[PDB]
């Protein structure tokens, strides 16, 4: 009789719970998500000035690696100039006739080193430049990522707008879910008083059948002036 | 009016909870995506540490050549020195070689110093690959500390959406139950009506009697 009857307040009162619980659940998840959204926001501003100093110090590197190169040109110039003496040395050797012999050799020893020294310089040149090639390649890539930040801050600046709405639209959930509670409320008291009215009426009906049954008796008995 | 008013708030709720439910699911993407350009540095930077480990070496492979050059400079200096004794030997015809000798030595000296400078200058420089490996770990760290808050925003959003999904169903079930309300009330109102009629029938059936009793009371006094 009270089987499926009470079983209706189960539905709502029970469904109505989840409704008031998940309204707070994903109501604060929304708040952290907007401050956790700043976890990535500052990490984006610090990501900037920082990957920025990687472009920096990585930059003044290529320059220092130049302040060399023109020194290398010097060394090379020194070599070139020297390779020439070899000759003045050798000429002198000649003029000195028989004494030359020694002179002679040193001329060749000179020119020789000149060549070796020059050779050195080249190597360390093609190297010192070839290198800086890769320092600009990398300098570029790091440069470019650095910009993918100001964007991280525009994307996560929305997780702040969107989340900031759940916080005022999901807030309404209460304001609304509340007036709905008023209905599950009122709804119950009428799905209620009904059963009462039903009973009180079912009652009084039975009472009258009795009363009535009693007059029928009296008659049977005290009518006997008809017995 | 009110079962209407409530039913109005009802679907209005079904409203927010649809948008306010997946509007955030979009955010779960504006997040999954705010995590793609966060996964960029993850190489754009990672690679940068390779180059760093490169110059640091190559610019040493160089210093090695610089040494060789130094050695040469040395050697020519000795040569040059010897060249001057040779000039001294030749007595008079050495005068001109004597100058070559000197000229060659000076070249040797100059060649030296230049190397020394390269040296120093390389030291400072490659010593900076220090701050390179640093700012590359640091700038490479806020780049993983970026991908941290966005590991969550994709979470949180993908968590609330899967929650509000049923937010509906209940809001849905509730709505049905409270529908009858208005109906039920007429149901009751009707009952109340019968009751009044009952009352009244009885109200009068009684007097019908109480008054009969009244006649027999005097009419037998």
From Swiss-Prot, chain B:
Coiled coil: none
GO biological process: cell motility; cellular response to amino acid stimulus; chemotaxis; detection of chemical stimulus; protein homooligomerization; protein trimerization; receptor clustering; regulation of bacterial-type flagellum-dependent cell motility
Subcellular localization(s) per the UniProt record: Cell inner membrane
Record-listed Glutamate methyl ester (Glu) modification sites: 5, 194, 203
Domain of life where this protein originates: Bacteria
Keywords: Cell inner membrane, Cell membrane, Chemotaxis, Membrane, Methylation, Transducer, Transmembrane, Transmembrane helix
GO molecular function: identical protein binding; transmembrane signaling receptor activity
Main localization (coarse): membrane
Topological domain spans for side Cytoplasmic: 1-221
Keyword Cell membrane: yes
GO-annotated cellular components: methyl accepting chemotaxis protein complex; plasma membrane
Boundaries of every Methyl-accepting transducer domain copy: 1-203
Residue positions where Glutamate methyl ester (Gln) is found in the record: 12
Function per UniProt: Receptor for the attractant L-serine and related amino acids. Is also responsible for chemotaxis away from a wide range of repellents, including leucine, indole, and weak acids. Chemotactic-signal transducers respond to changes in the concentration of attractants and repellents in the environment, transduce a signal from the outside to the inside of the cell, and facilitate sensory adaptation through the variation of the level of methylation. Attractants increase the level of methylation while repellents decrease the level of methylation, the methyl groups are added by the methyltransferase CheR and removed by the methylesterase CheB.
Family, similarity comment: Belongs to the methyl-accepting chemotaxis (MCP) protein family.
Protein name per Swiss-Prot or TrEMBL: Methyl-accepting chemotaxis protein I
Organism listed in the record: Escherichia coli (strain K12)
């Amino acid at each position: 009789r009270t089987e499926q009857q009470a079983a209706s307040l189960e539905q709502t009162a029970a469904s109505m719970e989840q409704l008031t619980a998940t309204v707070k659940q994903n109501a604060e998840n929304a708040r952290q998500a907007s401050h956790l959204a700043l976890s990535a926001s500052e990490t984006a501003q610090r990501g900037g000035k920082v990957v920025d100093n990687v472009v920096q110090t990585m930059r003044d590197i290529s320059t220092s690696s130049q302040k060399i190169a023109d020194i290398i040109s010097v060394i090379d110039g020194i070599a070139f100039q020297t390779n020439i003496l070899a000759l003045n040395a050798a000429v002198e050797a000649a003029r000195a006739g028989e004494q030359g012999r020694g002179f002679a050799v040193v001329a060749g020893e000179v020119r020789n080193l000149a060549q070796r020294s020059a050779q050195a310089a080249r190597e360390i040149k093609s190297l010192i430049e070839d290198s800086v090639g890769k320092v600009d390649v990398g300098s570029t890539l790091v440069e470019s990522a650095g910009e993918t930040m100001a964007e991280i801050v525009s994307a996560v600046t929305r997780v702040t707008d969107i989340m900031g709405e759940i916080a005022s639209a999901s807030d309404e959930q209460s304001r609304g879910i509340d007036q709905v509670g008023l209905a599950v409320a009122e709804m119950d008291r009428v799905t209620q008083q009904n059963a009462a009215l039903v009973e009180q009426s079912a009652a009084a009906a039975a009472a009258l059948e009795e009363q009535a049954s009693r007059l029928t008796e009296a008659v049977a008995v005290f009518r006997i002036q008809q017995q």
